[PDB]
């Protein structure tokens, strides 16, 4: 059963959650290759010299974290990621910190961001979109079972692996919470109405975000867009959404239910929970265990080149990894 799987998963998670791994590597053990992404921190392709394995290494500047008031969120991110284990999550292999920076070393996904492939091709076919959506459904089922809310769903945070399956990455806003929370965080296009209206909110905001994602994947643009976030928020709270003429009746109905301003009627947040989504007609052809097992053929598979090939990633300016001779923010990140 799923019940049976999730019960063991939670046992496994709980042990790691209460006794997090710490200081499992050092910077000098990795060769820095290429920056795969940057904002606020940055992610680099690196090579672990002792194995020759390639990984993606997230580097956070401790001082910058403090200034953005993201200390607790960063502590959440590392504690959660070292504890979880699921096929469609980027696995934390090592973590450490030095005088200046925090480091999280994860499994490398050479297929690049879904964002890149989605924007290029324009839009995905309903089957292509359904393939990805199912993996997000299963990942959220897993996360929510562990009382984890994710809060950062978008194509920019979904990596494609060499088999064409996805990895959900960026746990910067992930948090273990039973009951309601209040932090204003996320990405404008993906924010549930509760969040915009400074209400307390729960894991329903993740099922709403799934609605935005499926819509964007299938249409090629989000359901609520404008040049400024304010304008986007007005549309989200309006209570109106328009679907392209090419959207199937089943898709439109799924989305109306996921993109429901009314929490009592929003799929994923009803009495039956995630089964309302799983048993929808749009997922009728979905073999959920086959998705989990990865037996299903990927509708798109990234072009194989070398093991540390970066052509599915954009080019970013390469800045130094500077390490001060003085320890910064030791107290703040003691448990990291």
């Amino acid at each position: 059963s799923v019940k049976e799987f999730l019960a063991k998963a939670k046992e496994d998670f709980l042990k790691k959650w209460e006794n997090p791994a710490q200081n499992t590597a050092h910077l000098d053990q990795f060769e820095r290759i290429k920056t795969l992404g940057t904002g606020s921190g940055r992610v680099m392709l690196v090579k672990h010299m002792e194995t020759g394995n390639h990984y993606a290494m997230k580097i956070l500047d401790k001082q910058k974290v403090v200034k953005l008031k993201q200390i607790e969120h960063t502590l959440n991110e590392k504690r959660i990621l070292q504890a979880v284990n699921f096929p469609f999550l980027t696995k934390l292999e090592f973590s450490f910190k030095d005088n200046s920076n925090l480091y999280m070393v994860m499994e490398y996904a050479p297929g690049g961001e879904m964002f890149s492939h989605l924007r290029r091709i324009g839009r995905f076919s309903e089957p292509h979109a359904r393939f990805y959506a199912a993996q997000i459904v299963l990942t959220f089922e897993y996360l929510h079972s562990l009382d984890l809310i994710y809060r950062d769903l978008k194509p920019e945070n979904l990596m494609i692996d060499q088999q064409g399956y996805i990895k959900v990455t960026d746990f910067g806003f992930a948090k273990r919470v039973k009951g309601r929370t209040w932090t204003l965080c996320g990405t404008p296009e993906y924010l549930a109405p509760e969040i915009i209206l400074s209400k307390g909110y729960n894991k329903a905001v993740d099922w709403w975000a799934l609605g935005v994602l499926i819509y964007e994947m299938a249409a090629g643009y989000p359901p609520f867009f404008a040049d400024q976030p304010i304008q986007i928020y007005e549309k989200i709270v309006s209570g109106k959404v328009r679907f392209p003429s090419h959207f199937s009746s089943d898709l439109k109905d799924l989305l109306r239910n996921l993109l429901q301003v009314d929490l009592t009627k929003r799929f994923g947040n009803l009495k039956n929970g995630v089964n309302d989504i799983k048993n929808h007609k749009w997922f009728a052809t979905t073999d959920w265990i086959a998705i989990y097992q990865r037996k299903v053929e990927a509708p798109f598979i990234p072009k194989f080149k070398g093991p540390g090939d970066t052509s599915n990633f954009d080019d970013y300016e390469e800045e130094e990894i500077r390490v001060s001779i003085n320890e910064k923010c030791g107290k703040e990140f003691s448990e990291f």
Partner: peptide, 20 residues
């Protein structure tokens, strides 16, 4: 078209997160 309006918008690139 809606597509045309999207592609002409300033929000077709990678979208930054927000926070207080």
């Amino acid at each position: 078209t809606t597509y045309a309006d999207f592609i002409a918008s300033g929000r077709t690139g990678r979208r930054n997160a927000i926070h207080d």
